[PDB]
């Protein structure tokens, strides 16, 4: 599908509210496998199961290993911009 830019608002006591799978070491993108109900990703409205996360706050995640992506994603705070695509 089309590449999309999506804004997520997270408070400091919260996680993102997603599960991710995949990573470069497995030859697949960082993929959203779950959107947890009522948490920030669900509330933002624009992130969905099956979306590949291409970048977050301008940091490319296309070639990142799984744990690299976890570190990068969990570091982001507040108003967080995602670049995603559903394939």
């Amino acid at each position: 599908g089309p590449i999309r830019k999506v804004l997520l608002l997270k408070e400091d006591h919260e996680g993102l509210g997603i599960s991710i799978t995949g990573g470069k070491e497995h030859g697949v993108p960082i993929l959203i496998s779950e959107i947890h109900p009522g948490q920030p990703a669900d509330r933002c409205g624009g992130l969905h199961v099956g979306d590949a996360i291409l970048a977050v706050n301008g940091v490319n995640l296309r070639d990142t290993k799984h744990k690299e992506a976890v570190t990068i994603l969990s570091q982001q705070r507040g108003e967080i911009e995602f670049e995603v695509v559903y394939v």
Partner: peptide, 8 residues
Amino acid sequence: SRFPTSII
């Protein structure tokens, strides 16, 4: 999951 999954 086919590959590892992390909740974040």
